[PDB]
Amino acid sequence: MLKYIIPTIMLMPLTWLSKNNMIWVNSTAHSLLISFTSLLLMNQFGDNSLNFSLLFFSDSLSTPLLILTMWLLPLMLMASQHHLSKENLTRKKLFITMLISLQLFLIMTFTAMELILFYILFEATLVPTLIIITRWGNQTERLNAGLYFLFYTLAGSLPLLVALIYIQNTVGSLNFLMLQYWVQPVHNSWSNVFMWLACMMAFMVKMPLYGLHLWLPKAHVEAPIAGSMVLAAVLLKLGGYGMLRITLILNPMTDFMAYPFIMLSLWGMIMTSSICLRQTDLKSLIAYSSVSHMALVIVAILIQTPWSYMGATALMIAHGLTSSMLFCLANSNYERIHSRTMILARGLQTLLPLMATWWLLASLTNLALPPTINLIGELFVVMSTFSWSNITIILMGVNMVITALYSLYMLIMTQRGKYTYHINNISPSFTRENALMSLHILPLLLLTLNPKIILGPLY
Amino acid sequence: ATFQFLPDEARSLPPPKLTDPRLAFVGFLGYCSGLIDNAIRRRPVLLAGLHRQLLYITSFVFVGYYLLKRQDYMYAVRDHDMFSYIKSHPEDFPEKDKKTYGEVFEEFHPVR
Amino acid sequence: DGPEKNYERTMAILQIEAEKAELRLKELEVRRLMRARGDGPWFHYPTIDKELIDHSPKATPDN
Amino acid sequence: PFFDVQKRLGVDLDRWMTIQSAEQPHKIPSRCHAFEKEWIECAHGIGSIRAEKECKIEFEDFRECLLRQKTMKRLHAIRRQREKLIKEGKYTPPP
Amino acid sequence: AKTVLRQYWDIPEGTECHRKTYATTSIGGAAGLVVSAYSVALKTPTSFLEGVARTGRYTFTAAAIGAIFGLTSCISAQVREKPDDPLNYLIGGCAGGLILGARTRSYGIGAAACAYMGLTAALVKMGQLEGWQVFAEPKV
Amino acid sequence: MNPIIFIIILLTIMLGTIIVMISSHWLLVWIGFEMNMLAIIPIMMKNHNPRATEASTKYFLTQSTASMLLMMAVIINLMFSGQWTVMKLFNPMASMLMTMALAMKLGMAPFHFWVPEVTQGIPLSSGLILLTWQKLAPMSVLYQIFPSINLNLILTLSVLSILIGGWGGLNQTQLRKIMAYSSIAHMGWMTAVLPYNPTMTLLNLIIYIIMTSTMFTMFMANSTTTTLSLSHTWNKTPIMTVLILATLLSMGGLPPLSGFMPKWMIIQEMTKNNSIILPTFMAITALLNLYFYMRLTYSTTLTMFPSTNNMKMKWQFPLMKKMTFLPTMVVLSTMMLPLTPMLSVLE
Amino acid sequence: MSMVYMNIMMAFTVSLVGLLMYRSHLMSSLLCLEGMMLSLFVMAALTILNSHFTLASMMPIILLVFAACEAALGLSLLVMVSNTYGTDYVQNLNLLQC
Amino acid sequence: LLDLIWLEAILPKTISLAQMKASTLVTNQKGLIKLYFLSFLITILISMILFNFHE
Ligand SMILES: CCCCCCCCCCCCO[C@@H]1O[C@H](CO)[C@@H](O[C@H]2O[C@H](CO)[C@@H](O)[C@H](O)[C@H]2O)[C@H](O)[C@H]1O
């Protein structure tokens, strides 16, 4: 992984030693080059994972998550450089440094062999993310959003640290390859119930699980666009990636410990989908849409079937591009009208025709139109939960109806109807904004031609 | 020994390489200290006082090398003590009789 | 990398990690015995040094 | 000592007064010299965890010399019995 | 505290209710006395009688919680015929929370106390069942 | 104070500590504490004002009481073992008295009330000594007598300190009181692990001292003693605001910063001993510290508080305070986690 | 233990309680601190003399000397407190409340 | 009802309230030498009578 870690680190001197007016050009060009080389991780084998060294490994789960992570950095830079234009030079370079450092922590997090190394980088991501929200958010509520984000995470993560250290004492290793062979079954006792909770709750909060999700709508409504993109696209998936790995050592106790969380997720996805129908803030609507989508991922991980694990992987990747695209779409309106209220600016299709097309394509992926990888992921989870229990189809089917209604309600409210008369500063879509939207949707749809690369190890 | 940083018996161990990655990191920390020294005193961060920046790296590396020597020696002593104790008390560390998975019974827990 | 390189590189990684895991379990067992019995180098708490004792004849005989 | 500078330099800053069986002016012995010597030699070098068990006999004797709790208790027992007999006329002390 | 805790944990659960309720009342009362002592020491009462009143109010409140937890948790185990059940302690802990919602008269405090004293009581029973150590003896 | 006298008084503070650390005789340990307390008082008094006089008096009463209790423990130990060697004590009542005395000297809860008040009433440089160098001698005695300390007593002191330190810091706007309550909380971690692995006590002490020295030095650099005064740093020395942010996050125990290492290692040692509830309770309670550290980052670095007009006059002058070792300490305070295995040098 | 030790330890306890239970005068509390020293001196001297620990015979002197130096520092703080407020009342030393 | 009220109330809002109240109890001290040293007496007494730390 040194061929990715080191060039990522080099982006920092690159940004700091650039000419004043070339910080965005240089950082964007070379982060795109790093993303190109990330495709070399597709050397996956049917039986063995790609095991580089004693520290780092990559398998079919972490590979698509790595490529998404390295793809997002250039997109984030493009998305940020307009609202940061008036910032002074040193504070721009600091902002870019936080983005680079987040990428560095993330690629190491998704490839760490040892669970305690994973924990430390898993936790290091809080610092740049918190700094980005509270320093470069626009509103007073960003300070409170930072605190909710910080302490929800640490409330669950500190128990995880104790559980992991306890496991290493008992088993002798936290190396994931070792744990695949030395894993022992988990017996019923109150000790193991709390071991199970300590091992899972930190990941549930990050997904987020319904009931522990209140931090998320705060964090998005307050974060700057780049903070929203990485928060939605990648940082939520730390929780999903965490469970997909740690559930290896929690069987067979997951048979019954999953029940409370499957119920919260199955009911939660309907509650949070219904909430989207009455949201007045466009960014808050997109944030609540993430909670509903990640509820499926939690259910998929908890029922532990080959089909559910494949659907969970595809869903995490697909939601990453869709949700980040939706935040970018909402931000482009915000840069003109400087408000997140959905009903403020309407009929925008009349004024911005091509942008309305990006809105349509993002909506259709959000509601999982076949054969998008959004639909592939959701369908695989639906297929596997039906085998878990036939009645889940009622809840899963109802959530599909609600998802269409709010996905198209958002499209109809902002794009259709009559334009607002007094909003006369809707300038034409910039080339930068159009390129930003295409760099989301084009790879998303191209993946429909070869879905296997985003289906994970169980493929 | 007694109140000795590196006892004479530590000289039987291979010294840390001068290209040790941990020693490189220690040198890097010294370089970062040199830059912060420039920054807090509002000097040109990268260019000011290269003589001062050189000594920051050298001082960190010099101390870091001896700290790394003591670190490796202590871990060598931990292993030495452990193995000698395992030998002294063979009754407490018997060789476990190993069975193959064909003989060992493991309950099966279906996921259905 | 061909599969053979990755496959045998994996075995080298597993050998090191399994060897470390065994030593971690052994160390915890050795520490438990040393602390309980006090017969090892670790948990060796000081006692008065017997070279401090004066053995020369004293002012009176009964000592 | 936390930092055993004294032993590193071979210089005696305060060890000379730590125990009563050490060298004293004009070879004046402490009252419990032999008991402290025995306990110190029993426990030397084996560590305090082992010594607390293996040298309990020497330490109990040394403690008895130090505070004489068992001796005073025995004397109290014999005296109390003597008062009873004096209070009952069954004992007349000799001259 | 050792001996009182030894009387309580010697009686089998779900039986000898009056002895369990006495043990918790003494435990609760002692906690109330300790709180009163520090309260009176650090926040000087305006008078001798105010300080005595505060000591009684706190001590009685703490003894009230201790009594209700012991009785309710022992009554539940007896009635349900489940001695080694953390649920009985969860029930008794919430009862104590209600009392603390009554002495302070605050439905909010009572609801919060019942959840947190209820959860804490259940964890204590689990710890006794499984040998959880709070102040673990050094071993390695 | 005459500069030569200041140096000699400072050297005597250090000598008193060193005597405690090299002594093998309880009497010499007691002398080291007495010498150290004699020399510290003048530096608390050096700015001549009623607050400094009150702080020195409260300090004198606390420390002199603790030293009498220590002497009592030594003498009981003498009667029940007939020797003075610095090591395990041979009487449980002597052990309790010495443990309580060292707790009073360290300002551990419930003997903590003097720390916030004394620290508030003395200059920053004097508070730096009080909260760093002055912890060395009492900790070095606990390091040696721990085989005989009562486990329930020491862990009760640790738990109370973490709770009182965390709660007490939530209500503070004075920087000197924040550091004081932070010190009380950190002493709790040091002593909680002492019964299990004293090496982790040393590791937490060393990292605590480095981080605490960094904060005090940065406060001295700008002559800031209140939260609002610190909130003007962004408009005078922006680099300082960033260094404070990193140090505060490190003091909050956030990975991948240095201050995570002591909490990480202490949790490991406790779990190896099947202590699970206490480490978890400790780690969650330490989030109270993280909260009032974060509050300071908000008003110092992550937002820009209002300024004054006279601040412009300060733009025309450079920092002239020594800030000795600040560049080195800030790097250690934040960037040491990759070198964690180096702790074995403390064995 | 011996009968004398009962009262010497009682004297130390009495002075410790006196020290921890303040009234108004700081001087009254400083006297209790010296009381604890005097009881420590007697207890140490008795133990050392009875056991014939010859080299330890100097220890009570060192205790006396160092504790008198401590008391001199304590008195100097008392007069500075008295110069500020006109009395040595502890209730005046409450500025650091806030 | 759920997201803006009860899910807030039952965790972050109640936890924050308890910490704030505890902080005021700890820090609302009179700054009096007499009161602090009196609490020392109670601590030492309780340490022996109630918890037997002296054994
Ligand atoms: C013995 C160990 C010493 C190790 C030292 C290794 C590095 C030494 C670097 C010395 C050169 C520093 O260069 C000095 O700082 C910057 C970066 O180049 C230059 O100016 C800078 O302006 C802007 C950024 O602000 C950029 O276009 C670019 O970074 C550079 O041109 C200064 O005009 C130059 O004087």
Ligand SMILES: CCCCCCCCCCCCO[C@@H]1O[C@H](CO)[C@@H](O[C@H]2O[C@H](CO)[C@@H](O)[C@H](O)[C@H]2O)[C@H](O)[C@H]1O
């Ligand atoms: C969002 C919140 C999620 C909350 C999830 C709650 C899950 C609850 C899981 C209950 C199962 C716990 O584990 C269960 O505990 C009981 C004790 O009561 C243990 O019981 C054990 O001790 C009892 C003694 O009373 C013995 O009779 C029994 O033989 C033994 O198994 C069982 O070994 C174990 O099966």
Ligand SMILES: CCCCCCCCCCCCO[C@@H]1O[C@H](CO)[C@@H](O[C@H]2O[C@H](CO)[C@@H](O)[C@H](O)[C@H]2O)[C@H](O)[C@H]1O
């Ligand atoms: C800040 C100031 C710091 C100043 C530090 C000065 C350190 C001075 C160390 C003095 C002790 C020197 O070393 C010690 O001295 C005394 C006398 O010389 C010697 O002692 C000698 O006199 C008496 C006579 O019975 C006994 O101690 C011993 O029999 C004899 O050797 C010690 O055997 C020696 O180990």
Ligand SMILES: CCCCCCCCCCCCO[C@@H]1O[C@H](CO)[C@@H](O[C@H]2O[C@H](CO)[C@@H](O)[C@H](O)[C@H]2O)[C@H](O)[C@H]1O
């Ligand atoms: C929000 C949560 C806050 C933190 C909650 C922490 C809960 C921690 C669990 C409580 C500690 C366990 O509780 C303790 O366990 C041990 C088990 O060896 C019990 O041990 C008991 O076993 C035997 C028989 O069973 C008894 O006769 C004896 O009295 C006692 O030794 C203790 O009686 C009990 O007090």
Ligand SMILES: CCCCCCCCCCCCO[C@@H]1O[C@H](CO)[C@@H](O[C@H]2O[C@H](CO)[C@@H](O)[C@H](O)[C@H]2O)[C@H](O)[C@H]1O
């Ligand atoms: C489920 C596991 C995780 C649970 C984590 C719970 C711990 C607390 C997390 C949030 C802490 C944030 O810290 C603090 O919280 C409270 C509300 O909670 C915020 O306060 C907010 O609610 C209060 C009361 O409604 C208002 O008075 C205040 O105006 C408002 O800002 C503070 O502005 C914030 O500084």
Ligand SMILES: CCCCCCCCCCCCO[C@@H]1O[C@H](CO)[C@@H](O[C@H]2O[C@H](CO)[C@@H](O)[C@H](O)[C@H]2O)[C@H](O)[C@H]1O
């Ligand atoms: C799962 C365990 C997690 C443990 C995490 C611990 C987190 C502790 C966070 C800090 C607690 C104190 O944080 C503090 O909370 C209170 C109320 O909640 C806030 O106080 C605010 O809301 C309250 C409630 O209406 C008002 O009375 C107050 O006037 C207002 O300022 C403070 O502005 C905030 O600073």
Ligand SMILES: N=C(N)NC(=N)NCCc1ccc(I)c(Cl)c1
């Ligand atoms: N007291 C403890 N619980 N821990 C402890 N110090 N164990 C002694 C074991 C040990 C561990 C690391 C090294 I390096 C060395 Cl040489 C020895």
